[PDB]
Design a binder for this molecule. Structure first.
Ligand SMILES: [Cl-]
Ligand SMILES: [Cl-]
Ligand SMILES: [Cl-]
Ligand SMILES: [Mg+2]
Ligand SMILES: [Mg+2]
Lengths: 221, 241, 231, 244, 204, 195, 195, 243, 250
């Protein structure tokens, strides 16, 4: 479950922290929020390797572009470079991205689908929890949101995904990009899914495991 | 002495083919001038039509690169047009790849990096042209960036190019010592063109008719050239003061 | 002098010396004559031998049923250009079911020769060709030179002492142009023309080479006892 | 065209010599001396840094002695930049062999391939040859301790003791005079330094103008250690042999 | 015809107090047929340990590949590669074969020689990094290992204790998988010593 | 191309390979040698897709023979097996992969130890006291697990092989027309004339 | 549902705002009217990704054309669209309507359907899965209509399409191309539904 | 020195001597002219009759590009043909992508950039032709002249070859005496006269006249050759003016 | 057409000299003075901004370039050759390192890559050597602070302190007297300004002098918060004002 929400003086993106292989939870606290540039952040859904790889490649090329032009990078550059790359591979690179960030032109919020289609919105959501997240956004979104309102709406839309979607769970990651300020990245902003104390300690008596051989491994030169 | 025929170092660490490319720059015997207003960047160039059979409307050394970027060339028209077509291609490709209009200074750098390759690779000759790029950049504001056959480029408060470059340069240098500022403190581009022409007349010591000049103006979100009638109106204003 | 090293270098007077040297190879070549009426076009060629034990170098190459040439200069270069013509005549037949125009044949040879005069590493062709043919606009004779200059003519000659035959044809123009529906008489005029370029040596049975194309006559080459009639 | 400006780097002289190879060897003769001495129980590599400056960082510097793998090192004499191109090639070739056979590359095989690359630049490509001579010091389980040299020609040969670069004529006479077959590593260290000390164009041989390395079996039981000497370790071995 | 479950086998890695542990089974099979009971799936490049499950040809090939890459790293950098950096190199190398992948489930374990911080990571076949405080699991009995680890594991276990926990996690997971077992090896990794123990387990 | 066996005893490696070549419903040949000598002390048996087997075997033979001439040195069994594995590991992601399985038996003259390597068509290498490819191991692995010892003589190793071949001739559906047996020891490679 | 209509003063382009994955509306405020030049616009139907990729390339080609040869014709813009759509017809699913205003030619409308063919028409309408309709109440369309008439004609036409077709919906967007310049119109459901 | 031995080499002046040498080849060629008129352009050329044996009217030197552009050149004839072949490729690729037939200024730059490219490398030789070309587009009539350097401009009248200075002088008088403009049919007659007057600088061999024209009114904006009565009318006019 | 120059334009002369490298070094000698000094807690690199025209805006031309957050470069010689080398250097830091290991390269290894590019211009067909010498100052966790010189040949050497270009011989003598192993960063900046005043003839202020440091991490220049391990770039370019402040107490 990933979302983007525009407010008066910037944009905020949020994501859940669950990774799933079939019905199994592979990672309970993976980071779906990616830094393309210092003030351009990306929320990724789909194939986890693809969202990281495509986010780092464009992030690398954007950094080199910023050095070449001597200018802070723009979101439309990250958008154009991502969509053209994804289109080239005709959807085979399974990256569904919410791209948002503050640049010299202002605050921007975009979504990118794996086939290379892009959308513009004040509020967006992608992934298996998008329908749960979009229900909250469609219910509570209004024009001229404050920062505090936008964070609350974004985190609430993720929570809707965490509880109601089996593809989402664990914690809520937020990144706030305000105009004229440093982008603040709130890793584990909410932690509403803490494992309760176990009933018993499964610490074994030493010597419990049968051992055939022992040997010292030489890791030195 | 084959070290004077291709772009390899001479014993005293010089590239003669680059130095000779600079001399080709003045082959047209035309002088260009560029200045910055508050809201605009003006570029003026001498227009000489010696042949009576020439269609004067087709004789130009000012090119529209992008819709915001203007380029005046000092050098032979073949190399000028070679540089123009490439700049146009580069500005279009930039907009497609990165989703925003190529800045004046970034195009300048790109054309300067191309020029640098001709000074290092032997099979390519340098272009015998100096490119003056003008725009009102959305980040940096009124901008002048100039490229040469060595692959050198820099920004300018104002600049001049051609045979009588030094005379125009010192004329502008003296004005900016007096005004104490980095631009022409003027609201309308019309009066910035009037300044440019006035200071060229004072520097070269020649008068100008409507057909003796060629004018390019950069405003926010467009660069355009003036017609003979646009210049004529501008010359009348100077005369009546 | 300093400007003849390659074909990519102009002289201070605007000359291409490597091309002019290629042109010299043609003058050293044996004489060949071309002439035409409105109905027929004829090639006459003086073939050259190495010695009395050797054969006589074949001068005339067939390109299609309606077109062929005679050569003077580097024979291998004639083989390259005649092979190219054969392919272009062939392409016109297969793709458009159309006999290649003699004029287009000229244009294609010109443009092939030209590329070899503007590129470093390559050399100009060292041969001159006389192309004859009968197409939809009647009989045609062309003169090719490896500069790329192709010319349509009533008659001409190239090779050593060609000026003799070229002068005769210039005088005879009004006579031979009207030899319509009479092959033998048009050949006789071609044989009498090449005879003006002979010194000491005369036309023998295995020395003379004739070719003809016309209205109801495919491009055929006559050699040996077949040219005994015209001596 | 371009034919006018071609030096033709890969042609024979009327005497049947390769111009560019001969001139490259002339270049190498002006480079800092490198000495390799092979003992029964190890190999010594000693090299002289080219006229050092007082403000040159000595401790974190590598000009002459480079590691190819755990069992093979080279001493360089010529253009450092040219040497580094060839060294990175040699390092890869070694890892390609290890990947293919699961065995460390035998010394001669690595030397032959690096020598074959140099050869190529003298017979085709129309490029200048590599202005580099190497001393290869290495160990394998076939021939044990081995010394080789390669030069821009791509010719290589094996040695008990050898020098490359400046004053090789003088250096080779001194080595030929004092070297014997039943020599120890400690003895070979003393010979290498004494030889540089006499052939050097400098006033006196000091720690700051030297690079030093040994390939011993000094580690526990049938295994080879490569010791690239630190500045302080060169200072100590220079006092111990009584040169300072 | 599923490459990841032809040969079979498992790897598990765990963090303790100033230590890490990595363990694997020794089975290599051809589907139902057991072939080798000596096929170790854990390799080390200096002080960085790599376990690899999946298609056995790719396990051998990737070991040979990372030995090659870490050997060149050490020569150029003049120091052993650290776990955090090696993790990135595994990720880079797998995603390079995005549309023709190695059918593997690699696991990185080791202690950072500078910070002394225990480090473990897991990857999918195309190089996605799973960085975890607690434990990493891979192979044909991954479901079984997830169950054992999630119940048995507690934080800040001493080396001697952590050995028992990882051992019991592997042994009980392997015994509920047909394509895993036939012996097991556990590496206990402290800052400057590494003990390697072969476990006695049922041979069926 | 069906049955290839290998047993590593104290001082030698024994390879047994079926003699039958079957195309369609007919047995074309009953005397086929499914082995190539790679070097004087290294033998490789092979089985798999028709053509691919011999083509792969001869290609490896040529490459090892080339190394031997170039270095005037015999490559170790470990080195040869590693080379062969890498060739198969390349093959599997080719346009048309080699479908060949091999056993490599060699005597390492440096270690004075016999070595048996089993490599499948994927490039899955393993060192074993005894090995087999295809359905052969289905019967022989249980028998070898029972009777095999590390300190066995060559004669003991041949008797244990006879027990494997007898089990295969009893329970295998195809007539593989008996086996050619080859011993690899310190003295090189010899063929057991009668089996 | 998208249409373009020529009228007295120029040409109007109309489209809906609905983007669907299966039955889920991915975007309910989509802008399907795209600028390829100041007074050359297109209506996009079919794949969002494909139509965006094509429109971006066409915009690049017309920007480069303008630099070299000055303002391009609507016919030229249609040709560039066709070229991309025809040559890549195998890999592309894009149905496009090109509308532009010249001071010489006034309003022109070209349609590039799935084939990759080009057609010049007085007006065009595509509904459902890029399905172009012949006629669509030709008695409702006249030549040299007023702007107010043309807006009402498009508003009615698209509202009927949205009524009956679930792929169409949301707001009705329009773009008016005349000598005067570019005007953007929007009509919300509450206005256009009661027709 | 030796700065003139290799193309693309700048002299200490900043000159490409190899291009200036190519101009000498152009100056050596036969006279060719272009005249821009009210609604189109007229092209004329001098064809030297080397021999009686040359077939009259059947050695055409003026070439068409697309259907609306005329090209004539002086110098190395094959180099001209090579340039027109390229021009036809450029016009075809423009029409293929953009539909509209190539505008004349657009077409001018396509030749310009190609000729200029043959001054950037020593591996190639500059073109040994000056090319006079033009036609009718959407914006009206355009006449251009292109030189071995790649230099080109628009012209009211153009001339190149051995008789250029004579032709230029006669062209300059037409511009002065007709400021409001010259008609298409007039420009054909004037073209004939100027070639006959320019033939005085090449009077050893007698010559054959060849005229073509593009006119919005007379040819419907397409390139046609002047033949039959209209050609003989122009020859008669020229014959009357020399006497 | 096509690049027919597939042969070396740099060859050995009978004396064993590589002419084009020697001539390239001569071009570097004609170049404006630039220097580098290594302190215990940082590195300083400095150069004069020789302004082509007073109408020119010297701010736009940057002689001191960021290569990575922790590595900076200055030059002496041909400016254009430097500008394209900075571009190639920044890219190779990504393509051949960061996109593999997920971290920026250490100083010595980026230097090694720049050196390689310059060696190729010495041996490849149809190219002349680069007419520049680079000073590259950098920091990395395992090597700490370091300063490297790179020459047209491709050769590179590590320096405690050095100078290149016009007045390098005199500048190096000055640095030898002033340099010790106990220098703090502020002390090294002071010495850098003293050393550079000798080689500069005209105006000497923050507008005519370009100076950067590799020092402490700068969180304020990072552009984001929330990742404790990312503490910001060690490269900082000193402002016109910051230079003038240190010229008063000179
Ligand atoms: Cl323009
Ligand atoms: Cl660039
Ligand atoms: Cl869309
Ligand atoms: Mg050059
Ligand atoms: Mg089990």
């Amino acid at each position: 479950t990933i979302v983007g929400v525009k407010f008066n003086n910037g944009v905020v993106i949020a994501a859940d922290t669950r990774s799933t292989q079939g019905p199994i939870v592979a990672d309970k606290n993976c980071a779906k929020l990616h830094r393309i540039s210092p003030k351009i952040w990306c929320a990724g859904a789909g194939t986890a390797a693809d969202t990281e790889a495509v986010t780092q490649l464009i992030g690398s090329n954007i950094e080199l572009h910023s050095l070449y032009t001597s200018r802070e990078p723009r979101v439309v550059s990250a958008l154009q470079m991502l969509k053209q790359h994804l289109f080239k591979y005709q959807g085979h690179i399974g990256a569904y991205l919410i791209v948002a960030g503050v640049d010299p032109t202002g605050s921007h919020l975009f979504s990118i689908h794996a086939h290379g289609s892009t959308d513009v919105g004040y509020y967006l959501s992608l992934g298996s929890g998008s329908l749960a997240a979009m229900a909250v956004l469609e219910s509570h979104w209004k024009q001229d949101l404050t920062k505090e309102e936008a964070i609350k709406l974004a985190s609430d839309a993720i929570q809707a995904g965490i509880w109601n979607d089996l593809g989402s769970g664990s914690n809520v990651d937020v990144c706030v990009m305000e105009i004229g300020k440093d982008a603040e990245y709130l890793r584990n902003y909410l932690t509403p899914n803490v494992r309760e104390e176990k009933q018993k300690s499964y610490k074994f008596p030493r010597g419990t495991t049968a051992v055939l051989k022992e040997s010292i491994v030489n890791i030195c030169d | 002495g084959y070290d004077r025929h291709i772009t390899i170092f001479s014993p005293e660490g010089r590239l003669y083919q680059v130095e000779y490319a600079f001399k080709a720059t003045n082959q047209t015997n035309i002088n260009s001038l560029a200045v910055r207003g508050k809201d605009c960047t003006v570029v003026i160039s001498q227009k000489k039509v010696p042949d009576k059979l020439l269609d004067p409307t087709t004789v130009s050394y000012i090119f529209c690169i992008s819709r915001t970027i203007g380029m005046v060339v000092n050098g032979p028209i073949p190399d000028a047009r070679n540089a123009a077509l490439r700049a146009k291609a580069e500005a279009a490709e930039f907009r497609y790849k990165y989703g925003y209009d190529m800045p004046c200074d970034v195009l300048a750098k790109r054309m300067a990096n191309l020029s640098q390759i001709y000074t290092q690779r032997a099979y390519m000759r340098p272009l015998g042209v100096i490119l003056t790029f003008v725009s009102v950049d959305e980040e940096l504001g009124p901008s002048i960036y100039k490229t040469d056959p060595a692959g050198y480029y820099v920004g300018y408060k104002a600049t001049a190019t051609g045979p009588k470059q030094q005379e125009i340069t010192t004329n502008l240098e003296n004005h900016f010592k007096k005004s104490k500022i980095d631009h022409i403190n003027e609201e309308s581009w019309e009066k910035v063109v009037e300044f440019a022409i006035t200071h060229m007349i004072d520097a070269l010591g020649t008068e100008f008719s409507k057909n003796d000049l060629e004018v390019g103006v950069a405003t926010k979100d467009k660069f355009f050239t003036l017609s003979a009638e646009n210049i004529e109106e501008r010359l009348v204003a100077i005369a009546e003061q | 002098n300093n400007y003849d090293g390659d074909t990519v270098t102009f002289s201070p007077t605007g000359r291409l010396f490597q091309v002019e040297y290629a042109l010299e190879a043609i003058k050293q070549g044996s004489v060949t004559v071309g002439l035409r009426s409105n109905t027929h076009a004829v090639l006459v060629a003086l073939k050259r031998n190495a010695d009395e034990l050797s054969s006589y170098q074949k001068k005339i190459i067939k390109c299609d049923e309606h077109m062929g040439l005679s050569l003077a200069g580097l024979a291998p270069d004639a083989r390259v250009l005649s092979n190219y013509l054969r392919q272009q005549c062939n392409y016109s037949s297969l793709v458009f079911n159309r006999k290649l125009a003699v004029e287009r044949a000229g244009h294609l040879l010109c443009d092939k020769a030209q590329k070899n005069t503007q590129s470093y590493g390559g050399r100009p062709y060292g041969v001159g060709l006389l192309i004859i043919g009968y197409d939809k606009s009647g009989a045609h004779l062309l003169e090719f030179q490896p500069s790329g200059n192709v010319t349509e003519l009533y008659g001409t000659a190239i090779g050593a002492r060609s000026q003799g035959a070229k002068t005769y044809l210039e005088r005879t123009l009004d006579t031979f142009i009207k030899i319509d529906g009479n092959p033998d008489e048009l050949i006789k005029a071609g044989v009498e023309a090449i005879s003006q370029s002979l010194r000491d040596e005369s036309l023998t049975v295995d020395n003379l080479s004739i070719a003809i194309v016309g209205k109801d006559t495919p491009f055929t080459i006559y050699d040996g006892e077949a040219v005994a009639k015209y001596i | 065209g371009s034919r006018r400006y071609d030096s033709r780097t890969t042609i024979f002289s009327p005497e049947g010599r390769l111009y560019q190879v001969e001139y490259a060897l002339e270049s190498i003769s002006h480079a800092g001396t490198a000495i390799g001495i092979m003992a029964s129980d190890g190999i010594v590599l000693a090299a002289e840094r080219k006229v050092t400056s007082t403000l040159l960082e000595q401790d974190t510097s590598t000009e002459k002695l480079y590691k190819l793998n755990d069992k093979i090192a080279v001493a360089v004499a010529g253009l450092t930049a040219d040497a580094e191109i060839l060294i990175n090639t040699a390092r890869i070739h070694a890892q390609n062999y290890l990947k293919t056979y699961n065995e460390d590359i035998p010394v001669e095989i690595l030397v032959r391939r690096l020598s074959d690359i140099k050869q190529g630049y003298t017979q085709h490509g129309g490029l200048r040859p590599f202005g580099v001579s190497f001393i290869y010091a290495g160990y394998d389980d076939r021939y044990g301790y081995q010394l080789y040299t390669s030069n821009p020609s791509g010719n290589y040969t094996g040695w008990k003791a050898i020098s490359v670069g400046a004053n090789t004529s003088a250096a080779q006479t001194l080595l030929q005079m004092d070297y014997k077959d039943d020599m120890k590593v400690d003895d070979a260290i003393e010979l290498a330094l004494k030889t540089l000390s006499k052939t050097t164009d400098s006033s006196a041989l000091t720690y700051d103008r030297l690079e030093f390395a040994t390939i011993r079996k000094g580690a526990n039981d049938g295994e080879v250690y490569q010791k690239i000497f630190k500045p302080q370790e060169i200072k100590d071995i220079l006092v111990k042999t009584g040169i300072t | 015809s599923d490459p990841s479950s032809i040969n079979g086998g498992i790897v598990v890695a765990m963090t303790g107090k100033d230590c890490v542990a990595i363990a694997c089974d020794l089975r290599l099979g051809s589907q139902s047929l057991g072939v080798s009971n000596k096929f170790e799936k854990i390799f080390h490049y200096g002080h960085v340990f790599l376990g690899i499950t999946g298609l056995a040809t790719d396990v051998t090939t990737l070991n040979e590949m990372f030995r090659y890459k870490t050997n060149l790293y050490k020569l150029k950098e003049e120091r052993a590669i650290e776990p955090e950096t090696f993790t990135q190199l595994v990720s880079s190398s797998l995603y390079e074969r995005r549309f023709g992948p190695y059918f593997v489930g690699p696991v990185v374990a080791g202690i950072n020689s500078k910070s002394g911080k225990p480090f473990i990571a897991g990857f999918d076949l195309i190089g996605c990094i799973d960085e975890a405080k607690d434990f990493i699991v891979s192979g044909t009995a991954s479901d079984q290992l997830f169950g054992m680890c999630e119940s048995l594991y507690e934080p800040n276990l001493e080396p001697e204790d952590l050995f028992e926990t990882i051992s019991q996690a592997l042994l009980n997971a392997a015994d509920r998988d047909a394509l895993s077992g036939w012996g097991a090896v556990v590496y206990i990794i402290k800052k400057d010593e590494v003990v390697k123990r072969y476990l006695k387990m049922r041979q069926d | 191309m069906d049955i290839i066996l290998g047993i590593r005893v104290q001082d030698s490696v024994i390879l047994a390979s079926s003699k039958a070549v079957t195309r369609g419903i007919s047995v074309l040949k009953d005397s086929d040698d499914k082995t190539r000598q790679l070097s004087p002390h290294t033998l490789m048996s092979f089985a798999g897709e028709a053509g691919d087997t011999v083509q792969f075997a001869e290609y490896i033979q040529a490459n090892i023979q080339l190394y031997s001439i170039r270095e005037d040195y015999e490559l170790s069994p470990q080195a040869v097996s590693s080379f062969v594995r890498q060739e198969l590991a390349k093959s599997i992601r080719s346009r048309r992969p080699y479908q060949v399985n091999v056993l490599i038996g060699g005597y390492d003259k440096k270690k004075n130890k016999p070595e048996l390597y089993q490599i499948d068509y994927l490039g899955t290498k393993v060192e074993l006291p005894y090995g087999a490819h295809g359905y052969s191991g289905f019967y022989t692995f249980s028998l070898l697990d029972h009777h095999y010892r590390p300190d066995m003589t060559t004669e003991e190793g041949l008797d244990l092989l006879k027990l494997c071949v007898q089990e295969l001739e009893k329970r295998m559906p195809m007539d593989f027309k008996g086996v050619i047996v080859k011993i690899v020891d310190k003295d090189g490679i010899r063929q057991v004339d009668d089996f | 549902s998208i249409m373009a209509v020529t009228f007295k003063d120029g040409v109007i382009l109309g489209a809906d705002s609905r983007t669907t994955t299966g039955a889920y509306i991915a975007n309910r405020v989509t802008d399907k009217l795209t600028r390829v030049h100041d007074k050359i616009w297109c209506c996009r139907s079919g794949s969002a990704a494909d139509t965006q990729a094509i429109a971006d390339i066409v915009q690049y080609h017309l920007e480069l054309y303008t630099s070299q040869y000055g303002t391009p014709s609507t016919e030229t813009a249609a040709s560039v669209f066709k070229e991309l759509c025809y040559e890549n017809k195998d890999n592309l699913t894009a149905g496009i309507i090109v509308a532009g205003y010249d001071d010489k030619n006034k309003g022109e409308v070209y349609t590039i359907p799935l084939g990759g063919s080009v057609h010049k028409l007085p007006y065009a309408i595509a509904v459902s899965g890029s399905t172009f309709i012949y006629g669509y109440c030709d008695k409702n369309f006249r030549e040299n209509m007023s702007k107010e008439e043309t807006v009402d004609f498009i508003k009615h036409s698209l509202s009927q399409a949205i009524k009956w077709d679930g792929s169409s919906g949301g707001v009705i967007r329009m773009v008016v191309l005349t000598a005067a310049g570019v005007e953007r119109l929007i009509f919300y459901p509450d206005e256009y539904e009661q027709l | 020195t030796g700065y003139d031995l290799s193309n693309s080499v700048f002299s200490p002046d900043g000159r490409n001597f190899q291009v200036e040498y190519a101009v000498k080849a152009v100056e050596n060629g036969t006279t060719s002219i272009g005249i821009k008129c009210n609604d189109g352009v007229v092209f004329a050329v001098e064809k030297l009759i080397t021999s009686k044996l040359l077939v009259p009217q059947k050695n055409v030197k003026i070439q068409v590009v697309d259907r609306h552009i005329g090209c004539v050149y002086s110098g190395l004839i094959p180099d001209g043909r090579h340039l027109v072949n390229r021009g036809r490729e450029e016009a075809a690729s423009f029409k293929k992508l953009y539909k509209t037939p190539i505008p004349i200024p657009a077409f001018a730059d396509r030749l310009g950039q190609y000729v200029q490219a043959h001054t950037l490398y020593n591996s190639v030789r500059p073109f040994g032709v000056s090319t006079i070309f033009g036609g009718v587009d959407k914006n009206g009539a355009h006449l251009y002249m292109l030189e071995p350097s790649g230099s080109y401009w628009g012209y009211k009248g153009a001339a190149t070859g051995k008789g250029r200075q004579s032709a230029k002088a006669e062209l300059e008088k037409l511009v002065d005496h007709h400021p409001e403009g010259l008609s298409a049919r007039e420009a054909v007659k004037q073209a004939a006269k100027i070639i006959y007057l320019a033939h005085e600088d090449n009077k050893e061999k007698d010559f054959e006249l060849e005229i073509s024209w593009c006119s919005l009114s007379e040819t419907n904006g397409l390139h046609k050759f002047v033949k039959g009565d209209l050609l003989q009318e122009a020859i008669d006019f020229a014959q009357k003016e020399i006497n | 057409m096509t690049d027919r120059y597939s042969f070396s334009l740099t060859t050995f002369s009978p004396s064993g000299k590589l002419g084009q490298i020697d001539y390239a070094l001569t071009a570097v000698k004609q170049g404006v003075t630039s220097l580098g000094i290594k302190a215990t807690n940082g590195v300083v690199i400095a150069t004069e901004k020789k302004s082509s025209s007073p109408l020119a805006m010297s701010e736009t031309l940057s002689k001191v370039s960021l290569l990575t957050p922790d590595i900076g470069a200055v030059y002496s010689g041909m400016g254009p050759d430097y500008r394209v080398l900075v571009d190639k250097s920044r890219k190779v830091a990504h393509t051949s390192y960061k996109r593999i290991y997920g971290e920026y390269p250490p100083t010595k290894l980026l230097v090694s890559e720049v050196a390689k590019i310059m060696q190729e211009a010495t041996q490849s067909g149809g190219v002349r050597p680069f007419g520049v010498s680079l000073l590259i100052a950098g920091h990395d966790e395992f090597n700490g602070f370091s300063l490297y010189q790179v020459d047209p040949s491709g050769s590179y050497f590590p320096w405690k302190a050095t100078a290149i270009g016009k007045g390098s011989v005199a500048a190096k003598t000055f640095l030898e007297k002033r340099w010790n192993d106990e220098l703090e960063l502020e002390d090294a900046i002071h010495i850098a300004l003293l050393t550079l005043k000798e080689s500069v003839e005209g105006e000497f202020n923050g507008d005519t002098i370009e100076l950067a440091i590799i020092g402490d991490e700068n969180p304020d220049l990072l552009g984001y918060t929330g990742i404790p391990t990312d503490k910001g770039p060690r490269f900082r370019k000193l402002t016109s004002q910051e230079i003038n402040d240190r010229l008063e107490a000179l």
